[PDB]
Amino acid sequence: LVLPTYDDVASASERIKKFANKTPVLTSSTVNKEFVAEVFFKCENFQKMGAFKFRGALNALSQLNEAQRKAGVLTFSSGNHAQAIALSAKILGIPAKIIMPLDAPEAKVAATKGYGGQVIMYDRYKDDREKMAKEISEREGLTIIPPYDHPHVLAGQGTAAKELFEEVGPLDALFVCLGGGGLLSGSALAARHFAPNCEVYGVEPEAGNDGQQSFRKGSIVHIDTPKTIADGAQTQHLGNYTFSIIKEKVDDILTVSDEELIDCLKFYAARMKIVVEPTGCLSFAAARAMKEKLKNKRIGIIISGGNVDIERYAHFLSQ
Amino acid sequence: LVLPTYDDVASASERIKKFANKTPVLTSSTVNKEFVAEVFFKCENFQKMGAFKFRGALNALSQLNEAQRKAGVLTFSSGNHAQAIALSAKILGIPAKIIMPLDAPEAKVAATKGYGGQVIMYDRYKDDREKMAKEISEREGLTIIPPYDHPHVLAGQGTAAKELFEEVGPLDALFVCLGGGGLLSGSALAARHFAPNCEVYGVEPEAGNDGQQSFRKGSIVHIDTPKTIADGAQTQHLGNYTFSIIKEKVDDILTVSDEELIDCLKFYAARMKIVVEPTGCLSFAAARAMKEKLKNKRIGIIISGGNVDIERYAHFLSQ
Numbered sequence A, B: 001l002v003l004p005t006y007d008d009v010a011s012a013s014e015r016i017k018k019f020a021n022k023t024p025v026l027t028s029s030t031v032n033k034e035f036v037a038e039v040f041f042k043c044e045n046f047q048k049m050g051a052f053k054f055r056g057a058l059n060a061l062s063q064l065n066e067a068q069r070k071a072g073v074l075t076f077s078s079g080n081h082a083q084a085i086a087l088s089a090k091i092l093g094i095p096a097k098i099i100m101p102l103d104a105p106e107a108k109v110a111a112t113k114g115y116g117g118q119v120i121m122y123d124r125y126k127d128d129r130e131k132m133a134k135e136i137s138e139r140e141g142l143t144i145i146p147p148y149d150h151p152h153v154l155a156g157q158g159t160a161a162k163e164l165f166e167e168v169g170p171l172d173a174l175f176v177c178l179g180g181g182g183l184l185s186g187s188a189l190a191a192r193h194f195a196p197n198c199e200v201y202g203v204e205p206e207a208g209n210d211g212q213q214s215f216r217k218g219s220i221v222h223i224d225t226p227k228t229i230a231d232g233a234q235t236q237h238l239g240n241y242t243f244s245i246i247k248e249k250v251d252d253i254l255t256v257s258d259e260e261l262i263d264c265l266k267f268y269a270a271r272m273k274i275v276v277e278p279t280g281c282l283s284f285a286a287a288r289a290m291k292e293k294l295k296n297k298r299i300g301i302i303i304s305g306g307n308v309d310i311e312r313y314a315h316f317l318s319q
């Protein structure tokens, strides 16, 4: 397995520079005073299509040759990669078919269809979406662009962390949300380059801690689809490419409860005035849980996305 | 009445440069495509203490001499000026007494007390807060720093628009929220300097359209405290300083219903991933109402603040 390196992340910055947002970095006096540290939040919830996924989607599709682009692409996603792929595809004039979980946030399904993506659904807790993807693409001659286990995809995701380090310099610790591992693996590549001594932390919801288990065990652990509000991290196992990198460049994998996620979501709205989806609350929820360790340090927090159904979001804020 | 000019706004930029945030400017593809225009949002909901008020408070208090600072200051506010004054006062070691409406968002009262401000309350719909302010300050020897009708205060507020023009250049139109007129007057001064031909629009909630009435009539119109969710724009009349400027440098005053505000609040959360308080939704709500007029133009939208009680905010999002 030929693994991507930091070079690919740097090259990805160039391919997306034309359409991606150089998301702002926010800081909070309450957080810094509370943590007795300097905390920097990379806001991918302000990225095109509301999440960091646009980076990986565009970097991947941009490397498709003329025949591939015209032939069309296929992907499976919990919603954000689906939107990112649809948007990127429309921009490049590429036909796109997307396989989405039936219980995906309606806002994610709607944006995907609006961007021009043909949606097909699956049962997140019982269906084998990859098997569906493979067969469909094999039968229709479509190029599969995985939501995370692909060199171009993960290298692209790493551009967010790249921008964070270039804007604020080396950090003592970096917290990243963890689903399949594309964001974490890409971020780890950036971290090792800009700050080789940065502690890189992956964060998964407690019910879906396969990644953590894999990291401890040394091999990929498979679990049944986890029940959690972090709808963007219900993966059953890590990707092969992503795990190979996570295994060597990640320092630890933490978990937080849905309860902790909700408190974090309320914190973001109330104190930082931003809308963050549950999955985007993993990194900060974990950081809060270990504030004692972050005293007098510089911490980076990746805010992966803000795509939620408003009705659902209002409900969370009400807890 | 000696009116402040753009010079004061420029000098205010210097006095606050040490503690104020140079809030980011956001743009949205949905908005630009919907409006067929380039729309720039100045996010004061990311300012220190969650609103644009920090600018005017700091600029004013920074111009207090040693005796005045030690003597302490007093103010009356619906909540944001209260927080801004409290924060600014703590930074400068100034004792601060604040008069707040009993039905002010609990988050605003709490932050004011947390910043170290002594709070005293009044009945927004029946009490004469200015009379209370005058007597209390006269009896205790305190310097009154008005929430808007004061040269330093309004000049300070104008620094947000100053940053907006310096960052994106002249605009065809600028929408600003309107309560007492400090933000609008200050913004108008900045607009006339950076883009003398910019259309400057003030926006008030329909029930509290005294400002609009004043602008048409040519004199200050007084109304009973308006009932509206725009808790930051329930002023009964415009300030003397602010109206004198609004009268000469503002092109029109528009109104929007609370219903329109709620739709705007949901839009900000859903599409732009930011938390905006009802009062902060006036400017954009109006702009949407006249999109036809903004076609193929460059529009500036001031997002004045994001201070809301989460419970209340969740409730609005649920409509």
Ligand SMILES: *C[C@@H](NCc1c(COP(=O)(O)O)cnc(C)c1O)C(=O)O
Residues within 6 Å of the ligand: A051, A053, A076, A077, A078, A079, A080, A081, A082, A147, A148, A177, A178, A179, A180, A181, A182, A183, A184, A232, A233, A235, A277, A279, A280, A304, A305, A306
């Ligand atoms: C790819 C998947 N999106 C997931 C997601 C993550 C986790 O990313 P990784 O799966 O490990 O790469 C973190 N935050 C958010 C907001 C989202 O969506 C998809 O959408 O298909």
Ligand SMILES: *C[C@@H](NCc1c(COP(=O)(O)O)cnc(C)c1O)C(=O)O
Residues within 6 Å of the ligand: B051, B053, B076, B077, B078, B079, B080, B081, B082, B147, B148, B177, B178, B179, B180, B181, B182, B183, B184, B232, B233, B235, B277, B279, B280, B304, B305, B306
């Ligand atoms: C000063 C007052 N704050 C009001 C406010 C406005 C309107 O400002 P002007 O009163 O005309 O200067 C617009 N948006 C927000 C969010 C707020 O608070 C106060 O807090 O005392």
Ligand SMILES: [Mg+2]
Residues within 6 Å of the ligand: A178, A179, A204, A205, A208, A209, A210, A211, A233, A234, A235
């Ligand atoms: Mg997992």
Ligand SMILES: [Mg+2]
Residues within 6 Å of the ligand: B178, B179, B204, B205, B208, B209, B210, B211, B233, B234, B235
């Ligand atoms: Mg009014």
